[PDB]
Short mmCIF file of C-alpha atoms and ligand atoms in Angstrom, two decimals:
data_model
loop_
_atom_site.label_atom_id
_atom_site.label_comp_id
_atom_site.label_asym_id
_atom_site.label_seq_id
_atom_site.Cartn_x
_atom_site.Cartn_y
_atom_site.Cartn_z
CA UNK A 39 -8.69 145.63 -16.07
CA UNK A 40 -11.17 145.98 -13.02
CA UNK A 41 -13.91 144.50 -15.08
CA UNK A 42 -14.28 142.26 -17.99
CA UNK A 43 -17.08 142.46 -19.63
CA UNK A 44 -18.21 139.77 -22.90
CA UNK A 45 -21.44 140.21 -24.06
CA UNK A 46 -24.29 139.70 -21.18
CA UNK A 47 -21.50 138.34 -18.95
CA UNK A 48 -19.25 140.62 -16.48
CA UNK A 49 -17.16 140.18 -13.48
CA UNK A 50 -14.30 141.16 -11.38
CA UNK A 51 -11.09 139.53 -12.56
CA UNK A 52 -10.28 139.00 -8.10
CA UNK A 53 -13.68 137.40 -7.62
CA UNK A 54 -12.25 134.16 -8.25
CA UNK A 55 -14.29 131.17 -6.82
CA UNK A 56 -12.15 128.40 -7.99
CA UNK A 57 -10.90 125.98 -10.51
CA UNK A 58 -12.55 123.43 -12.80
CA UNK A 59 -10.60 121.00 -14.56
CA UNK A 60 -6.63 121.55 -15.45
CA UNK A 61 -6.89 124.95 -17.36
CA UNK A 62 -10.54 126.36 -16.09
CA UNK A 63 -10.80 129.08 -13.85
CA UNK A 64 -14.69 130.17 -12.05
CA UNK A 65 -15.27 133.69 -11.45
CA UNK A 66 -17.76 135.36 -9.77
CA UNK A 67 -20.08 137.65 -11.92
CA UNK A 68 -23.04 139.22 -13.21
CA UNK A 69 -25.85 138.13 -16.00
CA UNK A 70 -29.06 140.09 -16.49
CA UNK A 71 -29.13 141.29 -12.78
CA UNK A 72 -28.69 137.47 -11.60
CA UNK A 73 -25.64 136.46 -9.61
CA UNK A 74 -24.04 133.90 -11.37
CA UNK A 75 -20.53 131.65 -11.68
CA UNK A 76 -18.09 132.01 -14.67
CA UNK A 77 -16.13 129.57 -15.66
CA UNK A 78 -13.64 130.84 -18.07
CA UNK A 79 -12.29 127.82 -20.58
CA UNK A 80 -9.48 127.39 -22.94
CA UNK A 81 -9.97 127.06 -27.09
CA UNK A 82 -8.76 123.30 -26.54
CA UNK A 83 -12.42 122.59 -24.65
CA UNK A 84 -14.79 124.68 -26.62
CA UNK A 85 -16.37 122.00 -28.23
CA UNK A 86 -16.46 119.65 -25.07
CA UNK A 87 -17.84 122.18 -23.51
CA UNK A 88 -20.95 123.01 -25.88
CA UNK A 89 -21.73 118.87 -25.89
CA UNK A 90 -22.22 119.84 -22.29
CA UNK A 91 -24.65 122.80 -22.62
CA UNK A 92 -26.40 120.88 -25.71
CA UNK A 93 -27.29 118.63 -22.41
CA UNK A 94 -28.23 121.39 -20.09
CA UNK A 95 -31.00 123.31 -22.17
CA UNK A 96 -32.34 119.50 -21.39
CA UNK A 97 -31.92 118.89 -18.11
CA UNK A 98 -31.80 122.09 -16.16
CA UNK A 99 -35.03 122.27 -15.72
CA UNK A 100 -35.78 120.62 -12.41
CA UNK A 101 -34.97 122.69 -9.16
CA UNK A 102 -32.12 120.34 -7.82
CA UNK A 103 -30.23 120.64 -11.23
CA UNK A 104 -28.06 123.36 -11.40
CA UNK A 105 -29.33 126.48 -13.45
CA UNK A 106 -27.43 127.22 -16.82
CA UNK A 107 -27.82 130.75 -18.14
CA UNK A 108 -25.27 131.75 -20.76
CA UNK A 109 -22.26 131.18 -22.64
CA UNK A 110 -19.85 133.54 -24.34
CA UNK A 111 -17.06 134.06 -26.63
CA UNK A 112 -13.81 136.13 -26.51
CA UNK A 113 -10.91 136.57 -28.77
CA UNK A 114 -9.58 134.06 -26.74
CA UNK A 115 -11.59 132.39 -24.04
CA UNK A 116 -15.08 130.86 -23.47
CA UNK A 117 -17.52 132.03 -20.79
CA UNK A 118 -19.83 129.54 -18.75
CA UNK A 119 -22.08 131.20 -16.58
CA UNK A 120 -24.58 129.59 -14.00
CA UNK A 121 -26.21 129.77 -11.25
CA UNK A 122 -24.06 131.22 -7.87
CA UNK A 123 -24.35 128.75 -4.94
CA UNK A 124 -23.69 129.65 -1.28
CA UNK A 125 -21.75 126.33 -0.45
CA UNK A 126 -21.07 122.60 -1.30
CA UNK A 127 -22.38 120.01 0.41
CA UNK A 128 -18.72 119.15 1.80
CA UNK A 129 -18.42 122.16 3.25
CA UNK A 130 -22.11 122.25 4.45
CA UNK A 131 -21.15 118.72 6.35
CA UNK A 132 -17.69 119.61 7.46
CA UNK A 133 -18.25 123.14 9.07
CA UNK A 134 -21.86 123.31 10.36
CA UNK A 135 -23.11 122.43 14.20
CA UNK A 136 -25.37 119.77 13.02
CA UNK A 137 -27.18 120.67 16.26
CA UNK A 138 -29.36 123.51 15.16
CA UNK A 139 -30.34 122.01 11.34
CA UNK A 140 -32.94 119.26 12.01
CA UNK A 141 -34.16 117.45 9.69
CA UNK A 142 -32.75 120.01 6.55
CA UNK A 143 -29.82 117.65 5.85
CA UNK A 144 -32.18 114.73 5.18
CA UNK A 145 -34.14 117.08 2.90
CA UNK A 146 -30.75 118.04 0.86
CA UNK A 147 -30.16 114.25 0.42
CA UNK A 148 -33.93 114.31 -0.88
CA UNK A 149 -33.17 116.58 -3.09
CA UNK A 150 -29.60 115.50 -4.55
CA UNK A 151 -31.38 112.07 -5.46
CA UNK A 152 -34.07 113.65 -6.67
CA UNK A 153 -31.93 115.81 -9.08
CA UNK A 154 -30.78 112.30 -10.00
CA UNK A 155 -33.78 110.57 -10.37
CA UNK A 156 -34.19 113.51 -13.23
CA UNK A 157 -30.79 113.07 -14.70
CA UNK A 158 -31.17 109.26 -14.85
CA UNK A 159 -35.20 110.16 -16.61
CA UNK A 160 -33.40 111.51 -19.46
CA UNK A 161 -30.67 108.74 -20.37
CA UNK A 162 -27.74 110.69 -18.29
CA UNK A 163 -25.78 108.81 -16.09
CA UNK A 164 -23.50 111.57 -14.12
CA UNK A 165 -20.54 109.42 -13.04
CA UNK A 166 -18.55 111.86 -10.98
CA UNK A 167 -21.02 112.22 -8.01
CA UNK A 168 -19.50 113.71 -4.60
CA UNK A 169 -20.03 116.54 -2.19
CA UNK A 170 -17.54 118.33 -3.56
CA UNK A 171 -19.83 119.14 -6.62
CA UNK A 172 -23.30 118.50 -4.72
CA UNK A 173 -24.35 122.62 -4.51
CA UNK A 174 -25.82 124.24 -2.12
CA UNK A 175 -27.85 127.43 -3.03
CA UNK A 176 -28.34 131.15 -1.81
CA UNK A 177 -30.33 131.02 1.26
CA UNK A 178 -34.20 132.92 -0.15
CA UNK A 179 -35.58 135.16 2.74
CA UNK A 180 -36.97 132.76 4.59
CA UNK A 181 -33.29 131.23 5.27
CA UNK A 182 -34.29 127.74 3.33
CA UNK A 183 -31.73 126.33 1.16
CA UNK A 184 -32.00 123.34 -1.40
CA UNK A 185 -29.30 121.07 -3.03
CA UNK A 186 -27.94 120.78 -7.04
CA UNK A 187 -26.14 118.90 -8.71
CA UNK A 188 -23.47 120.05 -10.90
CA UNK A 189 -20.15 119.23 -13.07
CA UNK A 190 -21.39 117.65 -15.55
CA UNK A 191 -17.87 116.98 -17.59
CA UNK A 192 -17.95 113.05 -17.12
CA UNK A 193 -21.42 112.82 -17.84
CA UNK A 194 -22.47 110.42 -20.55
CA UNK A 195 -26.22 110.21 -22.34
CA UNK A 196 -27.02 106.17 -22.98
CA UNK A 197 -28.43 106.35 -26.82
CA UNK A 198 -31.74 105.43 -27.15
CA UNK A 199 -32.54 101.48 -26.84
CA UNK A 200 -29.09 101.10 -24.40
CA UNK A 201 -29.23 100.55 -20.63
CA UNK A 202 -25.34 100.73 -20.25
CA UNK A 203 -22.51 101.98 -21.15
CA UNK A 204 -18.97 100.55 -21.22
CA UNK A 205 -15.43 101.30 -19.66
CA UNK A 206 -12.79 103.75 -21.10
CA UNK A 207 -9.32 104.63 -19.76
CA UNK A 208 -8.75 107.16 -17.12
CA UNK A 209 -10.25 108.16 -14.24
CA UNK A 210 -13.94 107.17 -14.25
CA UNK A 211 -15.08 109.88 -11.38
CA UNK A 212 -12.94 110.65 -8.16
CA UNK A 213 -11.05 108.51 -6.37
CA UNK A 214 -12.77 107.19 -2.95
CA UNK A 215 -16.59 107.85 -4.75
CA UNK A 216 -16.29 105.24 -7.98
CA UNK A 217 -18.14 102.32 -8.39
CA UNK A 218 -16.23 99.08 -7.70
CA UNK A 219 -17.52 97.82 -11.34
CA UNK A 220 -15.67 100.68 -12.74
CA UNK A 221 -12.32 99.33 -11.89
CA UNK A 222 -12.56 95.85 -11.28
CA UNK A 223 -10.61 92.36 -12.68
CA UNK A 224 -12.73 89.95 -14.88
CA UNK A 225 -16.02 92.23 -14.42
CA UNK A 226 -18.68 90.96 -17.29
CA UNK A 227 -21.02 93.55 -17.00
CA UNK A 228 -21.26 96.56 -17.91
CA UNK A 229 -21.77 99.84 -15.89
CA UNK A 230 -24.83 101.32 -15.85
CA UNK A 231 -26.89 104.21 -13.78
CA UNK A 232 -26.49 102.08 -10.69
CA UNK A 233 -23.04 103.67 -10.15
CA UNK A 234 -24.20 107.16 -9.24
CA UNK A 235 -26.44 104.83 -6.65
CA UNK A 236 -23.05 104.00 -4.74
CA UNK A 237 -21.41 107.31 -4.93
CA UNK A 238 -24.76 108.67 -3.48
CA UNK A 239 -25.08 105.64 -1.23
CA UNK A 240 -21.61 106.96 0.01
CA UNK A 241 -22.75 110.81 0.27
CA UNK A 242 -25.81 109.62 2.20
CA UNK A 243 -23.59 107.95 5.21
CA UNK A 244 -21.09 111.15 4.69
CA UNK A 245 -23.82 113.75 5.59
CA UNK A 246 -25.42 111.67 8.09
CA UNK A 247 -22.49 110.31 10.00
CA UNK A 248 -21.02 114.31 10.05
CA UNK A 249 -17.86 113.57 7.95
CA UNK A 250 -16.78 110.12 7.80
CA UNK A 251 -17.20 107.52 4.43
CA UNK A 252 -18.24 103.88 4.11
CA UNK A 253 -15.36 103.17 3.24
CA UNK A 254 -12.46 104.48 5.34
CA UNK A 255 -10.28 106.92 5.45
CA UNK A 256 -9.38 109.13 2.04
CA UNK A 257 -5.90 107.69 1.95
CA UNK A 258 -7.30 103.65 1.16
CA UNK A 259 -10.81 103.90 0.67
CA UNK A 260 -10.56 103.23 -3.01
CA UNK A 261 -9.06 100.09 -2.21
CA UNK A 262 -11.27 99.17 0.29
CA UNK A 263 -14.39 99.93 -2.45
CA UNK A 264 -12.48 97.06 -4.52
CA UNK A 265 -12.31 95.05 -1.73
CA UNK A 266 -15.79 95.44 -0.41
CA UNK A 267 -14.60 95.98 3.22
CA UNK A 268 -17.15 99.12 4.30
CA UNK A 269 -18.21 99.71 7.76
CA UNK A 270 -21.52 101.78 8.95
CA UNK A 271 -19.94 102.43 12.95
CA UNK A 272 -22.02 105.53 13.05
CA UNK A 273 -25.52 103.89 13.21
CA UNK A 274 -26.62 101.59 16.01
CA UNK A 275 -27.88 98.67 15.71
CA UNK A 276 -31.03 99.13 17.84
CA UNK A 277 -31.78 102.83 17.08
CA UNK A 278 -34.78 103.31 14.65
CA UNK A 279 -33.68 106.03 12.59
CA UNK A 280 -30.04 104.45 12.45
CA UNK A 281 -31.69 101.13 11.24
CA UNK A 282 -33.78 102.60 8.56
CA UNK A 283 -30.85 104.74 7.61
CA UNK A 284 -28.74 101.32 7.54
CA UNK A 285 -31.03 99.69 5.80
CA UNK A 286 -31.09 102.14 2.75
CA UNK A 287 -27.48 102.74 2.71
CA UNK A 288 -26.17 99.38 2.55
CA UNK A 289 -28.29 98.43 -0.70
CA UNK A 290 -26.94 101.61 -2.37
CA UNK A 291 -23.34 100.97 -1.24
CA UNK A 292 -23.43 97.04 -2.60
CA UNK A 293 -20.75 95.49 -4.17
CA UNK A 294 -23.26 93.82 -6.99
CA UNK A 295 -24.75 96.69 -9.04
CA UNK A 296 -28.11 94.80 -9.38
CA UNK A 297 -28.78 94.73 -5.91
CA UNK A 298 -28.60 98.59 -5.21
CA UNK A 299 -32.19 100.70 -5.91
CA UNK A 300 -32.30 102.81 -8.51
CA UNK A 301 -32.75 106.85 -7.55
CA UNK A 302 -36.82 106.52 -7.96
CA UNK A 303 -36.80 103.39 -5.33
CA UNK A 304 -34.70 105.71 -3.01
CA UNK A 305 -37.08 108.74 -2.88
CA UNK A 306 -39.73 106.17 -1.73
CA UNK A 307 -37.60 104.43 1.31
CA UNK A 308 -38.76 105.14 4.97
CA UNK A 309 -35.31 107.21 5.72
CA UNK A 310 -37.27 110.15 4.08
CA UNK A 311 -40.72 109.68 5.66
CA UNK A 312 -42.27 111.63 8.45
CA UNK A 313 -43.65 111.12 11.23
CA UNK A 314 -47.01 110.53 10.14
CA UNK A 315 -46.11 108.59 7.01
CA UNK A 316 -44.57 106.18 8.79
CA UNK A 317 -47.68 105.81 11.57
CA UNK A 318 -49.90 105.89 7.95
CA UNK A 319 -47.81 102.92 6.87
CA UNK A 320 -48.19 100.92 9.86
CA UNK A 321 -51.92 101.70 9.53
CA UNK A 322 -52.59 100.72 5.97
CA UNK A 323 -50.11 97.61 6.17
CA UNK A 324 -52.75 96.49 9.01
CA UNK A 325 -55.94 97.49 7.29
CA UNK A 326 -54.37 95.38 4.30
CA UNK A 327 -53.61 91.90 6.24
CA UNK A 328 -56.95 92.61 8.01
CA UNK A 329 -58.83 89.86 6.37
CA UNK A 330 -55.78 87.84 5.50
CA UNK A 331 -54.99 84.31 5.80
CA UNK A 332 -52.28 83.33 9.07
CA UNK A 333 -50.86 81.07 6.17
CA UNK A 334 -51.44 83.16 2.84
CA UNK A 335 -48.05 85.02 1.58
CA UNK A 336 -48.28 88.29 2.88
CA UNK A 337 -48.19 87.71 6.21
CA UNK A 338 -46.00 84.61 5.89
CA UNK A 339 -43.45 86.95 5.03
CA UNK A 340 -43.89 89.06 7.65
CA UNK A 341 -43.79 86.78 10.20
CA UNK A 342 -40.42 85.17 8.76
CA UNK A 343 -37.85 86.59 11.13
CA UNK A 344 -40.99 88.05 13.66
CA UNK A 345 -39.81 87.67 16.68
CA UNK A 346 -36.70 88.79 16.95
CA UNK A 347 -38.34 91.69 15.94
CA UNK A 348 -40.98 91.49 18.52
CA UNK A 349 -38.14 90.90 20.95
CA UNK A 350 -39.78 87.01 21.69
CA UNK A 351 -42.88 89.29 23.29
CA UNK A 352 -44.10 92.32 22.84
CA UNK A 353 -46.52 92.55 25.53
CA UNK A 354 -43.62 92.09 27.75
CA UNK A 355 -41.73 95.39 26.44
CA UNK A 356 -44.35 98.00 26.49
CA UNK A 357 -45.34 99.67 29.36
CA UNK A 358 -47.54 98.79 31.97
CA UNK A 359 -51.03 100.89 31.21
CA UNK A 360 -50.68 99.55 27.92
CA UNK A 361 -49.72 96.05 28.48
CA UNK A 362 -53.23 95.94 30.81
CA UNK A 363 -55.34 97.47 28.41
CA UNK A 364 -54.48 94.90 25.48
CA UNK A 365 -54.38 91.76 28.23
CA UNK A 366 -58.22 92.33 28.72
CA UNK A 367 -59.12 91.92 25.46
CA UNK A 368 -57.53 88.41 25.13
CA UNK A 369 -56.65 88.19 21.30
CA UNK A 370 -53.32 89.77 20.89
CA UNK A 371 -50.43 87.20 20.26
CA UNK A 372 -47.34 88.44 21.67
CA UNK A 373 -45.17 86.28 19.19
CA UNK A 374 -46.61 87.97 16.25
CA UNK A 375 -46.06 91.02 14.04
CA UNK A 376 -49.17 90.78 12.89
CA UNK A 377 -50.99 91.64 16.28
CA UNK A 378 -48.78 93.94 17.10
CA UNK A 379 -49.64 96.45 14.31
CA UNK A 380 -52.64 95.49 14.86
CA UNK A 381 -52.57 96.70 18.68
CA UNK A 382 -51.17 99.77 16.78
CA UNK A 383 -53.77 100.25 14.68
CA UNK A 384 -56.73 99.55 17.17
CA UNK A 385 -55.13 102.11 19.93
CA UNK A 386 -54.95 104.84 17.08
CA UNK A 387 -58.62 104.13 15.56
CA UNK A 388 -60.35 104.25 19.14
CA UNK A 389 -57.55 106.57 20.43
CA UNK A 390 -60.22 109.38 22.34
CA UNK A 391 -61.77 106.80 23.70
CA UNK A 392 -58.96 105.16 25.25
CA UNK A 393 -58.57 105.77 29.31
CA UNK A 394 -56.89 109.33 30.03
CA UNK A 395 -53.37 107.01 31.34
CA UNK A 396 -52.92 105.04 28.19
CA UNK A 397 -53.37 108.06 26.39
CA UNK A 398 -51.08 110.07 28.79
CA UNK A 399 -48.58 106.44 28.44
CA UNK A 400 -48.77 106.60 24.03
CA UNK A 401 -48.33 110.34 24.09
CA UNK A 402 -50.07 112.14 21.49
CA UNK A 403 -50.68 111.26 17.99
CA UNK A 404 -49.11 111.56 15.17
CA UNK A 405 -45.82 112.30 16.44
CA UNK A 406 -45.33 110.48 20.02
CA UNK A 407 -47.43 108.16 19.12
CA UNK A 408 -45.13 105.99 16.61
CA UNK A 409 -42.30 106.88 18.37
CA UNK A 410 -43.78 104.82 21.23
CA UNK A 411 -43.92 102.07 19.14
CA UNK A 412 -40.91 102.75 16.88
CA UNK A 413 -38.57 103.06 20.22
CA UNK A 414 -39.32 100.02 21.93
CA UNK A 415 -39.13 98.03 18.32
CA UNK A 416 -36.26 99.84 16.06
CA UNK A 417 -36.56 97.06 13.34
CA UNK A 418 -39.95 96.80 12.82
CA UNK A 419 -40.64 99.42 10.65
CA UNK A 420 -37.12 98.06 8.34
CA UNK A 421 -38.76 94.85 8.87
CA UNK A 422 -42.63 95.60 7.66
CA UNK A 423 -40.88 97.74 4.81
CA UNK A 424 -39.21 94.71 3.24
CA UNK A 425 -42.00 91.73 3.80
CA UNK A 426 -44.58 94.02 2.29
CA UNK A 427 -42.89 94.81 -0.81
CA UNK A 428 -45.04 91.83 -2.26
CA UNK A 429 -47.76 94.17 -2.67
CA UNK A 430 -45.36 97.08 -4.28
CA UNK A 431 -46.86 97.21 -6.89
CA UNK A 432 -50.78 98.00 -5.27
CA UNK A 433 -52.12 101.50 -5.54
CA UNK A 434 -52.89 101.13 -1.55
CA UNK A 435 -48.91 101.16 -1.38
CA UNK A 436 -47.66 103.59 -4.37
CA UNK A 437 -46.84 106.01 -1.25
CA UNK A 438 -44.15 103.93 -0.01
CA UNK A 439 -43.36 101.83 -3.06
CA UNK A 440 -41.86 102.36 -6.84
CA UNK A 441 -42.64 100.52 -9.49
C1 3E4 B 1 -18.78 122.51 -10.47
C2 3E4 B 1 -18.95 123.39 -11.66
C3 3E4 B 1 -18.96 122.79 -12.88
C4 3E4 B 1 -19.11 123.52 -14.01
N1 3E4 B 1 -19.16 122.91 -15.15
S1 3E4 B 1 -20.44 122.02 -15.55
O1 3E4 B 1 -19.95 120.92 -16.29
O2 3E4 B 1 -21.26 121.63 -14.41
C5 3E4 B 1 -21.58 122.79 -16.44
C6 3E4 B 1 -22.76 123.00 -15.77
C7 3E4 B 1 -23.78 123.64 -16.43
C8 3E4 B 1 -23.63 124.07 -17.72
C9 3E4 B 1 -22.46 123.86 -18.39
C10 3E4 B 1 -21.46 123.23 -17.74
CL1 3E4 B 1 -20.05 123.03 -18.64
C11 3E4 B 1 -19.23 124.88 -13.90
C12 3E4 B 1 -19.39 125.65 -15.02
C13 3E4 B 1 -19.49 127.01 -14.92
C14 3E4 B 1 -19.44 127.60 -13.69
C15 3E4 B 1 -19.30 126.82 -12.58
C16 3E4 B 1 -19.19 125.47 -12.68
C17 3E4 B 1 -19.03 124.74 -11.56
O3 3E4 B 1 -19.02 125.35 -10.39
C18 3E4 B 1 -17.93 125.83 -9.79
N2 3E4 B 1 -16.73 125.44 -10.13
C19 3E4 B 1 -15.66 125.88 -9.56
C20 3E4 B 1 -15.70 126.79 -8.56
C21 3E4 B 1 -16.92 127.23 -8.18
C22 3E4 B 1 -18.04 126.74 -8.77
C23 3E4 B 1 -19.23 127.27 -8.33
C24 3E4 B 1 -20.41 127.19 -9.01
C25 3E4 B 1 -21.52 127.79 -8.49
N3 3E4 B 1 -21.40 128.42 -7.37
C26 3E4 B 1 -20.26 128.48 -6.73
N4 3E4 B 1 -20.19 129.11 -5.61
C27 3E4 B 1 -19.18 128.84 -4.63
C28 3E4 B 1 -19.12 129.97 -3.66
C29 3E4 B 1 -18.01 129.80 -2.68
C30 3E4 B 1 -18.22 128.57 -1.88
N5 3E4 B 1 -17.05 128.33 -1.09
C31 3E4 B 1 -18.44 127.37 -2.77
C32 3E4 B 1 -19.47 127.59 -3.84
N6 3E4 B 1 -19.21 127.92 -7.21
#
């Protein structure tokens, strides 16, 4: 038999991608001209199976969800065919010079939670998040590629009116991925969607750190999820992009399931902004505590904690062109956040008409601009991010907010 062929389905018997669950075997194969995967499945799941495409005529339809196409039925066998990926996301991580990709893994992590942001829209919770099942697809002509999320056999839709669901026996996801609240002694809460938060908290470090997990080692980093004991080695301290990245990862990755965002918060965090969203930030933050009291809330809060943030002066850590150009106009305190965004937002506003060698000193705008500032202060965007989250919930800040 060189090719089997039920209904709209057909494929080589030797194309063989892979296996499933115990008893599942994934062909490659053909459906109305499309390339597609097969997953052949026993009489024993054909029922568990269809509860699972009843779900994916539903939720399919967003481009980071994996396709579904067809299903179909043999004397003895049923036929699952999808969408045929290029990759997963572990082997993405594991095998590619991270050198020569930029900013796309970023964008796949966009994408993944994005996929689960949509998921999580329609009542699913997917439990069994990991890279191993985190697709990548066919390259289009242009070369760009896009994440989905797949495997959707642990999956479980909350009815309508519940916001959690409660523990079973067995393996709730994959070992060194699973929520500590799935597992853990005298626990009086139930699970809810904020699990697929720490497995994705824990794919988030694994792409960006090139391989490694919050946790440890895959031999005891189940028990170290238990145990709370992660570690984030691969982002410094005093790097920008490493701080923002920190800052996201360790809420998704808590031990106490209210703490971590849900998927909708994530897609707004400053890990995924550019450039110029992040200079636009800086800029409306300052045009908002414009008029604002020294004492009122706002910038209460964003003071708090200042100047360590600052380091003590700022004035003192920026370079010298600068440093004389903001001296002369005697009203920026060096002690405060405040001033300096507002120093930021001043030197962008009246930018052209700044002398030629603090222009030359900033660099040019959007880009080299920030990253002057961002540089010489790596906490003070993680730091503006969190003390204006008073005004979240202001259309001025629906950008960088959700809610
Ligand atoms: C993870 C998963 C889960 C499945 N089940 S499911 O619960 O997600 C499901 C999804 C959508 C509708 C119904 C179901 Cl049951 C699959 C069902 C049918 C076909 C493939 C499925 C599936 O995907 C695969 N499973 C095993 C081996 C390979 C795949 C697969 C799927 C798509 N593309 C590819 N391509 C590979 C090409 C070779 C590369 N090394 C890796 C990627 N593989």
């Amino acid at each position: 038999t060189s090719v089997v062929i039920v209904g709209k389905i057909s494929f080589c018997p030797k194309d063989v991608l892979g296996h499933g669950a115990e008893g599942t075997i994934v062909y490659r194969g053909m459906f109305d001209n499309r390339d597609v995967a097969v997953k052949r499945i026993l009489p024993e799941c054909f029922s568990f199976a269809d509860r699972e495409v009843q779900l994916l005529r539903e939720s399919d339809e967003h481009p980071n969800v994996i396709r579904y196409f067809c299903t179909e039925k043999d004397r003895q066998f049923q036929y699952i065919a999808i969408e045929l990926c290029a990759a997963t996301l572990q082997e993405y991580v594991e095998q590619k010079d991270f050198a020569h990709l930029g900013l796309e893994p970023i964008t796949l992590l966009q994408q993944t939670t994005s996929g689960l942001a949509h998921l999580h829209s329609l009542n699913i919770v997917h439990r069994d998040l990991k890279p191993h099942n985190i697709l990548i697809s066919m390259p289009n002509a242009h070369g760009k590629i896009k994440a989905m999320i797949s495997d959707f056999g642990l999956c479980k839709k909350l009815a309508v009116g519940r916001h959690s669901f409660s523990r079973r026996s067995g393996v709730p996801g994959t070992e060194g991925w699973i929520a500590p609240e799935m597992l853990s002694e005298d626990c009086k809460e139930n699970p809810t969607y904020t699990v697929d938060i720490f497995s994705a908290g824990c794919v988030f470090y694994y792409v960006i750190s090139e391989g490694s997990h919050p946790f440890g080692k895959s031999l005891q980093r189940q028990a170290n999820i238990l145990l709370g004991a992660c570690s984030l080695d691969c982002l410094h301290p005093e790097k920008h992009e490493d701080v923002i990245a920190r800052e996201l990862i360790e809420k998704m990755i808590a031990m106490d399931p209210q703490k971590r965002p849900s998927a909708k918060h994530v897609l707004k965090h400053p890990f995924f902004w550019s450039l110029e969203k992040q200079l636009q930030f800086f800029q409306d933050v300052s045009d908002r505590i414009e008029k604002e009291s020294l004492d009122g809330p706002i910038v209460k809060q964003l003071e708090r904690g200042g100047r360590a943030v600052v380091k003590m002066d700022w004035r003192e850590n920026i370079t010298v062109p600068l440093q004389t150009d903001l001296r002369k106009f005697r009203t920026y305190k060096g002690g405060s956040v405040r001033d300096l965004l507002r120093a930021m937002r001043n030197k962008k506003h009246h930018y052209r008409e700044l002398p030629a060698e603090v222009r030359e000193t900033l660099g040019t705008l959007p880009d080299d601009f920030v990253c002057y500032f961002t540089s010489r202060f790596p906490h003070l965007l993680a730091h503006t991010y969190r003390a204006m989250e008073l005004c979240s919930h202001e259309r001025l800040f629906q950008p960088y907010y959700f809610h």
